[PDB]
Amino acid sequence: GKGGAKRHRKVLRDNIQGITKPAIRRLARRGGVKRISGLIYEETRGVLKVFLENVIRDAVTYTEHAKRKTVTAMDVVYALKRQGRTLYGFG
Amino acid sequence: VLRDNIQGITKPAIRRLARRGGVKRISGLIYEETRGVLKVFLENVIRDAVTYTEHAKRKTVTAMDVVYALKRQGRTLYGFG
Amino acid sequence: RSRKESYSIYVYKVLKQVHPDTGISSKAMGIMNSFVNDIFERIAGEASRLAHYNKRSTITSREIQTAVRLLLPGELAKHAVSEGTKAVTKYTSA
Amino acid sequence: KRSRKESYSIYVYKVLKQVHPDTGISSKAMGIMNSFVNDIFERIAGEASRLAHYNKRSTITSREIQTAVRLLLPGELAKHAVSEGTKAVTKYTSA
Amino acid sequence: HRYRPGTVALREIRRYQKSTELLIRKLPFQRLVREIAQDFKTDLRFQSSAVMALQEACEAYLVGLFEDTNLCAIHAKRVTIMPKDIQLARRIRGER
Amino acid sequence: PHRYRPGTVALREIRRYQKSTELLIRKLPFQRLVREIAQDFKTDLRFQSSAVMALQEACEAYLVGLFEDTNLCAIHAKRVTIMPKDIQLARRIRGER
Amino acid sequence: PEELRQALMPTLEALYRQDPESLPFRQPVDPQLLGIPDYFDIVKSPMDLSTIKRKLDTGQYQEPWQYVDDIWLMFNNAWLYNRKTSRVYKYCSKLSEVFEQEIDPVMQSLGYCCGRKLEFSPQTLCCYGKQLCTIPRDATYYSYQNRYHFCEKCFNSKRKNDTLDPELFVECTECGRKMHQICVLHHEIIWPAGFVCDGCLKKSARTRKENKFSAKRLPSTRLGTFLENRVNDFLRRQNHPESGEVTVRVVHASDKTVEVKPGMKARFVDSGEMAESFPYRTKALFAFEEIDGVDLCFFGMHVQEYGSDCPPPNQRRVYISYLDSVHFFRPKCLRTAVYHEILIGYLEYVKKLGYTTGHIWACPPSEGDDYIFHCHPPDQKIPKPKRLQEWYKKMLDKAVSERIVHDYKDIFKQATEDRLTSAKELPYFEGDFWPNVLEESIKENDLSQKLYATMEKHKEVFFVIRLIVDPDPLIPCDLMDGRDAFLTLARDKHLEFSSLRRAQWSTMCMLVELHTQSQD
Amino acid sequence: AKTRSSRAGLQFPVGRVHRLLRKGNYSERVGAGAPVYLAAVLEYLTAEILELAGNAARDNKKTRIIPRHLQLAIRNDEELNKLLGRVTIAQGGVLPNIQAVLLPK
Amino acid sequence: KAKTRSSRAGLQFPVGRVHRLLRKGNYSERVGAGAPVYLAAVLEYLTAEILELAGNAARDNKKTRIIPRHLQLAIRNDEELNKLLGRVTIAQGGVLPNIQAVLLPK
DNA sequence: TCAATATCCACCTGCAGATTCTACCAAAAGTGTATTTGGAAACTGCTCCATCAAAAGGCATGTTCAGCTGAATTCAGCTGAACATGCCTTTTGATGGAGCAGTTTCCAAATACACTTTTGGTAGAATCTGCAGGTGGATATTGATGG
DNA sequence: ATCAATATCCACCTGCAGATTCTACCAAAAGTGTATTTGGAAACTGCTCCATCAAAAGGCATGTTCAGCTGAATTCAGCTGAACATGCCTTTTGATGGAGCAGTTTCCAAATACACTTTTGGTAGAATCTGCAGGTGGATATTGA
């Protein structure tokens, strides 16, 4: 490729560590948590990735059912509403 | 025949339900609050089921209306549908 | 293009009636619109299945009343039902 | 007066015979089976209508009920379910 | 001869987990349902199957609830349930 | 040297983050995680910015709710520090586990 | 060169005006500067727009074809060392389109008919060891001495078949211009005196000698005469301004025999229940039009005729084996109708001969498959099976309205009406579906149930039409003896029907070959 | 020349809600009073939660209601809270709540 | 002669009845031809596997007639079917035998 | 490792309940014929998504230190468990009638559809306006400093 | 009890993206007006099945005791919170290619809408069959002692 690489999909990795320690600390503080053990962070990351896998799977199956290659917000709203997470401000 | 049949739900009944719930030791204050939870769920099921009842212009509640109430409360019951 | 309908003007009129000197933000307005849509669809489905229960093929105000009592928790319904009645009462006045 | 009530009972009985020739079902458990099959029917059909409304489609066909199978039924269950569904629609089409 | 505290308890645990029979006596639950229905509308008649469905559904809900409360009591390094366990279970479930 | 006792600053950020509403998880790393998950599901997908924002606010809401339940469970066990058993019990009672 | 500069500069300037289409090509690309070191290691000729600009300015272009070749060559090496998703790729495509649309009339002005650097389709080759299959395209092949070719599984030089054969050229007597052979339509056999361009003929007030290889000069037959008379009468009735006379010629007619397959040979003829072979007559008729004063073949049809002196059930039966056409008929709107007329007339003709039953196998070809005409036009949408069925049904209904055809049915319903009981009562035709599938299932009412299910599976595909001394003598022709020989000649000599000019050239070559085949 | 919304004293559009409930194919037949009743319930809920949001905004020395005000309004009323128990308000945050044992005491 | 759509698709659940119930379900004004076939196939599949699981539970329980206890044992022991019916109560099913670790002696 | 007891099983035997067979027919279901239309493909306009570029500082990351919370241990008040004893509330069967449905009439009420009027979005430009963000200094909040 | 190093509260003021204010169009709503259809109101009534009561019976309600569970008091290794240095990589503004989302036409394969013949599922009555619920006999871990 002329422009830098050539069809660089850039297969992703190590993203869950992108959810940093202070980020999980802030999420816990919004939940009223005062003290956080060291092994809380990774298992909260695990819960986060489980939830994201579920919601993204539902939304993506929604989106090939719509015959689309781009994930919109409306099918996401559908996915969470089915999963028992009714969300506002997005359609 | 005795009144306030909320206490009519005998304490060994709560004991047996807790045994089915896997509980081996039951505190003295457990019985009254289990009675409270039971009765609360009870007005819920009775209220929506009887509302189904006057919706049909009937004076008798049916078991199928009970199934409606349970499934609407998210507690779908099989065997009476 | 295809028009996307919303309750913007009606919710704004209600807000002006109940709070003349207050404004609403865009995100809060989207929350308002999705709220009214969710209540609409939940009540519509509940009333429709009540129609299915009694082999009733027509949607009238009665099963709408029943859905309002079932879904709206207690005191809210005690007004909601009433308000609807008043509305249909006025609709049964001309 | 004789008022008939409909149920998928007898078909479930043939299904049991196909899966277990020498096994029976009691009336209570059989009503359990009927309630379960009715519940699955209602959920899948409702989800199919939900997809039809979402994708602005006015006709219910096999594609969106297949999609509802993927969304609602568990992974292995959903995959194998899509399997017999495709097999059956092709068999009926070629029939 | 006296069994130690817990052996008969776990025996009843196994007995009631291996059985599915009704545990709430029919008549008191029927009477309670009667007065509860009386609190909302007067002069009602109930099907026997309606009472059975109400009772069996309620035992199922409470059995799951006591599973939850046993788990919550275990969470606090305990084997006995107390009111804080039922409050925690119901709050996490979200009925309140 | 001036030093605050453990807990006072904790409650400080408690009230700060219970008063504010701005997103606490960084947008770019979360979006990278979303792209990873989608690619692991289906390759060659594109994501709208509004969709990523919906996922972000939704996951923040789910996490803060689970953290409130976790704190309630921790207080139930006569503790102030959250533990793995806390979230495990909360998720089991909620019923997704 | 300065006059040539004036002639060619507007097109290059118009290419320059394309912004930002021409920007990557305005300055000489350098591998180090652009960051792509592997540019000049693959292509051996570096150039750009500025190279041709300075070549024009200096004045070393002896012929405009060098200019055209250089432009198409930078286009080729641009697409070669580029991904299709890249921006320079679409810029190169747009610049090529602009070049074509600008240079065609300008190059026409200078005297050449056109100025397109054209190449033929990838010439697929054939194997030599097994003598039955061919060399696959875009796949590994082995070649020896450029005359022997083999596939991957035959022998069990290595290359993948991607070469393109360029179009040939001819030279004028008084110009020496490298004119396209196809475009000017010059054949060595037709005019041995020498190729002369139209400009020289106009200047000298001379006209080319009349072509004696035309389709009209072909020997006439009763069937061909009847078909052409019917088509011409229909066209005269329509009276469209774009309608031209149509010539239908039967170029091959020979008696042949079809043999029974061994699977049913053991079962029936050996037991004494079915004929050992069936004699028929194969015929080849083609339709031609005079478009712009040039003959063009736009239809082909292959039939098998079993007359009265034939064992049953094949007796008195006409079967359509292969039919093909190219959509260059003028006017277009009548084209389909004209085809129907042919599909009517032949039937009526055989109805005059005493034939009873007609058979049609309505199956569209697979992707990249040609029946008679090779290299169908890319824009010629091949019909789907149901559209082809409706196409045949329209012709059948039109024939019914004319009382020529009594009725038609599917083979399953025809067998049901005929109360067929054994496979020996089914008509046998050369190359048909049934002769092969009967043997195939024999390898797999013992046989009748299978056959009935097979018709039930494919009832709509087959058409049976309920409608002998032929007055036309035999016409021996090996080239038209089946579609295979014509396809082989078209592929070997590059006789393509993709374009109108190429269709005309192929028609001329085919007519010359047919006229020279009748000389012994 | 009187609209159905003005005829029954409705602020939400009776025609629009009727059309939307018909378009959802909840049924084959729909009477006239049901869309009016549903619309009326809509103004009722909208009006009460707007009062709550405006009160929250006034409590926060603000004259424009924001999603934070909506969340404070919904979560501070138990009936609207149970109406929206499985519900998240985007950019609404959570109610300020600290368990007693967390406090220094 | 007049093959039923269930037999035409090789299914034992009634395609026609599913089609009729989905029509009068009012989920759409129009219904496809293959939708009842596919849906009947899905319901037959679920009923099948729950039947083999219930029969296996009955055989492990030394019984030849499947009872609701066997259905509960089958559905709860399969985690996929478990979360399929994670919010559904079965009549006369009971609960899985489960004793807690801390509640155990010694 | 003797001994009392709940319970798995080896066996059994009666029955409510599950299974088999004949008959009927209104209710569905498949086939036929006509009409209607939903969205596929074919083309193309156009919003927006992925990608690249560059600067910079808000917190991410890492280390240090010690505060106190989780975890372990010990032991005492006592709340429940296990069990014997007395009775008493419940279950089951039988029996009057309150209403759930089956049948018939018919009228207020809900589609169907062709016009005709009203208006909810909404492009585009203009003015208004609540609050994001930075400044500065008054006011709790914390923690351990003199004694 | 006072005091100093910080976080908190908050009034004020400026620039601006977002909130609010008119013009004009207008197709999709929204409305009004007959012809048509039928869903359900209404009255009479057969038939379930639901309320009520007496005796057979299967547990439920209380007092004792102490084994063991729960909870208070003590201690400490260590870890996670508080503060800080360094810099990174995320955030914000800008532009741009173009894959792809989306609007418009055509029109056919698939849908609906009855008419009709076929078979098929639901129900009632007889009578034979059968898995299993308990009841009796050992009797086999098993747990307290």
Author numbering:
A (entry chain F): 11 to 101
B (entry chain B): 21 to 101
C (entry chain D): 31 to 124
D (entry chain H): 30 to 124
E (entry chain A): 39 to 134
F (entry chain E): 38 to 134
G (entry chain N): 1051 to 1206, 1232 to 1519, 1578 to 1600, 1612 to 1664
H (entry chain C): 14 to 118
Question: Paper's wording?
Answer:
Here, we report cryogenic electron microscopy structures in which a p300/CREB-binding protein (CBP) multidomain monomer recognizes histone H4 N-terminal tail (NT) acetylation (ac) in a nucleosome and acetylates non-H4 histone NTs within the same nucleosome. p300/CBP not only recognized H4NTac via the bromodomain pocket responsible for reading, but also interacted with the DNA minor grooves via the outside of that pocket. This directed the catalytic center of p300/CBP to one of the non-H4 histone NTs. Representative writers of lysine acetylation (Kac) are E1A-binding protein p300 (EP300; KAT3B)8 and its homolog, CBP (KAT3A), which can transfer an acetyl group onto the NT lysine residue(s) for all four histones. That is, p300/CBP reads H4NTac at the bromodomain pocket, rotates in multiple directions, and rapidly writes NTac to non-H4 histones within the nucleosome independently of the DNA sequence.
We determined the complex structures in which HAT is directed toward H3NT (p300H3-I·H4acNuc) or H2ANT (p300H2A·H4acNuc). In all complexes, as in p300H2B·H4acNuc, bromodomain of p300BRPH bound to H4K12ac of H4NTac, but the position of binding to the nucleosome was different for each. In p300H2B·H4acNuc and p300H2A·H4acNuc, bromodomain binding to H4NTac interacted with the minor groove at the superhelical location (SHL) + 2. Importantly, in all structures except p300H2B·H4acNuc, HAT of p300BRPH interacted with DNA through one or two basic patches. In p300H2A·H4acNuc, the density of H2ANT toward HAT could be modeled for the C-terminal residues after K13 (second panel from the right). The distance between the substrate-binding pocket and K13 (~30 Å) suggests that p300BRPH acetylates only K5 of H2A.
